[PDB]
């Protein structure tokens, strides 16, 4: 920008028929691309950078840009690189990926990749809606989620979870998902056995508090077995030689889930019209000093009217509880 | 050494108009300067090379070539957010997120033909009306949760990302908020224009489960009462009211049935002369206990502390009371 | 004539130093060598050309000129995380996800001034203390779910993303977990310092619905009992305790059987009772109030589908049923 010229000028411009070999340049015009053109970024893996800079990380397989304060970082942000995962008992997921889980075949385990930066993320989704029968297990190795370093199982059908590194203290956390319930942290197999004869109920070495039961590797519905003290009873009957396991588990809640007391449990006597303030919907039940009753059988009630109708002249100071 | 085959410019060179270059192999810094302009190549093809980049003129999406996946939006996926002008049906587009305004009324959205696994559309009830005016989501010939059947959302301030699974199971909700009960409408058993004030209607066949629409607005579940095969409306529907009754197969996702438990004290017998019974596992709610069959509520039957886990009863118990403590942990 | 107007290099060439170029049009393959560095133009201009890309100096964000959107970030959905060190209030920034530690007391976060539709911030309760020291989201004077009022998250392991939809509705939530019921605090119904340990406290006015805070922490819903205008505490709170009660408006976000016989009556000499249709688990049956449980008055096998009562009934007695799962007849 001073004295006389350092390098040869080409005022008209210049055309090339083959690749050139250029020690970099400074564009003061437009970069165009005719058809069939092709453009790459420089590979590069260095912490240090100029902001404005762009690169391809052949480590990360991920397009980064150096940023005034964040340094190097996925370009224009990071979303969900979705990918189906063929069923397989342990799979190691990698950051920035979303996994479509086919547990139709049976249960499977997924291991979170070692965390690098606060906010690293993986996504799992019940592609085929089979996690109720055949749960998924999310292992953070030694890294830990929600405190506990332990594994948790996702037991709910068609559930998706984006796990996100919070740092070391708290570890991975779900930041985003659909249809979450009681995450299950399996505690210890209280009973594992293959069955000789068409058994129905078996005795347990200890009194189970909260368990899940696996029949032939599939997990039974809370409906399929009575529980009592330290005997599990099976409705219906279990076939002969049914590989069956009972597992005690702690429950972690990541989802979000009563009765009405009439005049503080004391009545007035000679009354039968139960005008209720809290306006709700269907209500076919109410209790009376312990024993309860069912509506339109011994209790009339229409939402429109809002009040409730009793039968026998309500006894004075009567424990009156109204459901909804 | 080796006689070269290309002119060399030891101090580099300068140019004052656009050059026309059959590519080069950059070996240095490649900066720009005020009002310089960069443009990625315009490619649609599928054969690429990792670390390559481009502008998709069919997708309007900047894509890089990935070792693994191949040509994808840079940094995986994006919520292109747009308000959607209210219309009967809208076809929608991969990668975009749509804000739906059903204040006007009912409306339906068609999903894009799927190109890749993980193609994703987002929709939001930005206006809190889906309950009042259900959004239908159509997958066309392609299936959403394992069948081609359209599905309708009916939950105020829903919001949900449909992601493409594979030809097989198909479109599924990868993320979202407020997701309640998805409804896949079955045969429309009853549709008619009421000619007079009507409080009840007779149906050809009794309905297992249905949604009721009056003058194009979904009716609140409370408002309609149904018996064997007769729908009863409180209040009575006004005359010249469009009325449609549709059976639907519910599809559940957001909720995560269970809430209580079945325990017993002292095996099922009454020790006698005990007002404070201790529980073995620490529980979040013990709202009431069952004594022989009737129900005894908190601050009326007893009291309890959920760290102690010790129920404290307001009467001196007796022998063979079938004490059975409810687990309101939920 | 048909002459060229610019000099032609059939074999291409070689520079050993930075060249200064009024740009080009590439007809070939653009490539780099180890140590090579590449950058994007700087440009704040609204105007652009589809396929144009840039680094926005004020935005501090690589953008591309989209045909429809215009100059928008490449890859759209870009959630940069970062752990917000706790404070009474904190301004948050478009694009950023905040990990929130209400492990001590509560905290308050001030959603940013919006710019385009789709502007978004994500907040996340990574230590599960919202349930005890909740977060209140302030949208300044921008109006959140239809109103300008602050809302408050009480859900424990909660995550939410907020996403501007234009001023009429305003900030609304488009992704999250356990986003249950937002609380919009109203008038502070009770403000006082506990004189001494007290079992219960009489409200100045009866409360429709409220939240209770003791010594900074929010008392759990179960822990306080409310009857009309009288509130009871099990267990009773300690002496010299700071207590507050606020009426609140709940905003719903996530939104997280029955059977009988003999026409609502019975008959006589009924050993058992054939079920209407084969169903799963059969808990208990209501009879003269005191409902008797299974294996304490009756048995039933799903396959058989029959209420095998373990006795015999008499005259004038009502019976209601309860089952488990969904038999779907």
Author numbering:
A (entry chain C): 1 to 257, 265 to 331
B (entry chain B): 2 to 257, 261 to 334
C (entry chain A): 2 to 257, 265 to 337
Could you pull the original sentences from the published paper?
However, the SeMet TSP4-N335 containing three constitutive methionines and three additional engineered methionines designed to increase the anomalous signal (Leu12Met, Ile31Met and Leu145Met), were all twinned when grown in KNa-tartrate solution. Thus, phase determination was performed with SeMet protein crystals grown from solutions containing lithium sulfate. The diffraction quality was rather poor and required five merged data sets to yield sufficient anomalous diffraction signal for the identification of 15 Se sites, corresponding to 5 SeMet residues per monomer. Phase determination by the SAD method yielded an electron density map that enabled the building of the AD-XD1-XD2 trimer. However, the electron density associated with the XD3 domains could not be traced. The crystal structure of TSP4-N335 reveals a trimeric protein comprising four domains. The XD2 and XD3 domains share the same threefold symmetry axis as the AD and XD1 domains such that three XD2 domains splay apart and do not interact with one another whereas the three XD3 domains pack together around the threefold symmetry axis. A linker (Gly179-Leu-Gly-Gln-Gly-Arg-Val-Tyr-Ser-Arg188) that connects the XD1 and XD2 domains exhibits a well-defined conformation in the two TSP4-N335 crystal structures. The third linker connects the TSP4 XD2 and XD3 domains by a glycine-rich flexible long polypeptide (Thr250-Pro-Ile-Gln-Leu-Gly-Asn-Gly-Gly-Gly-Ser-Gly-Ser-Ser-Thr264) that is structurally disordered as manifested by the lack of associated interpretable electron density maps for both the wild-type and SeMet TSP4-N335 crystal structures.
Bacteriophage (phage) vB_EcoM_CBA120, discovered by Kutter and colleagues, is a member of the recently defined Kuttervirus genus of contractile tailed phages belonging to the Ackermannviridae family. Each TSP recognizes a different lipopolysaccharide on the membrane of a different bacterial host. The 335 N-terminal residues of TSP4 promote the assembly of the TSP complex and anchor it to the tail baseplate.
